[PDB]
Amino acid sequence: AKPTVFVVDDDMSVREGLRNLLRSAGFEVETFDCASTFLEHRRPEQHGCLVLDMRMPGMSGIELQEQLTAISDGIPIVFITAHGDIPMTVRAMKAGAIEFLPKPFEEQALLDAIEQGLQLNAERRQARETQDQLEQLFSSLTGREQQVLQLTIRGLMNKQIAGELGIAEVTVKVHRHNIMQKLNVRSLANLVHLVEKY
Ligand SMILES: [Mg+2]
């Protein structure tokens, strides 16, 4: 749905402050003062950025990240550190971290980061509802139709496909005429795009 930033910091200085700043910037805000609460009320199918403290009672920022990874939730993470005596990992950096901001932070860089995170979440999101519906469409094909696709996009003509499947040429006209309709294409050109964009 909407674009929310989920602030997960134990500190009231932060959860309120950020809740406020981000709201004074177009965003809804959902605040949690522990990771596990978050995990419970997280709905993977809900667009947004996660702004996440690293040191927290219970599951640390990193450990929370490890779960989101484990359940293939890809909410981009913008971590926020407090200390020098700990460097983030290569796994933490690979585990979809957008940015690391120190506490307290240049309010413009947080703002920078949360955008960059939102942009990427909406991109990783489109490229999954797009490619899903492009496989809902392909699902609706039967098995005889799927042989008539895999032969057409290969360049064959009605008669040859027939004299290649041992069916009536008229069967093929209908088979093709159906494929086009299931797949919502109206031009051979498209057919071979969809079918290539698998
Ligand atoms: Mg903390």
UniProtKB/TrEMBL annotation:
One MF term in the entry's GO annotations:
DNA-binding transcription activator activity
Provide a GO CC annotation, any one. Answer: protein-DNA complex
Q: Would I find Cytoplasm among this entry's keywords?
A: yes
> What are the UniProt keywords, alphabetically?
Activator, Cytoplasm, DNA-binding, Metal-binding, Phosphoprotein, Transcription, Transcription regulation, Two-component regulatory system
Domain (HTH luxR-type) ranges:
134-198
Could you tell me which InterPro entries the record lists for this protein? CheY-like_superfamily (IPR011006), Sig_transdc_resp-reg_receiver (IPR001789), Tscrpt_reg_LuxR_C (IPR000792), WH-like_DNA-bd_sf (IPR036388)
Q: Where in the cell is it found?
A: Cytoplasm
Tell me a GO biological process for this protein: phosphorelay signal transduction system
Coiled-coil regions, chain positions: none
Domain Response regulatory, chain residue ranges per copy: 4-118
List residues modified as 4-aspartylphosphate: D53
Could you tell me which Gene3D superfamilies the record lists for this protein? 3.40.50.2300, Winged helix-like DNA-binding domain superfamily/Winged helix DNA-binding domain
User: Can the keyword Metal-binding be found in this entry's annotation?
Assistant: yes
Q: Which residues does Mg(2+) bind?
A: D9, D10, D53, R55
The protein's name: Response regulator protein TodT
Q: Which organism is it from?
A: Pseudomonas fluorescens
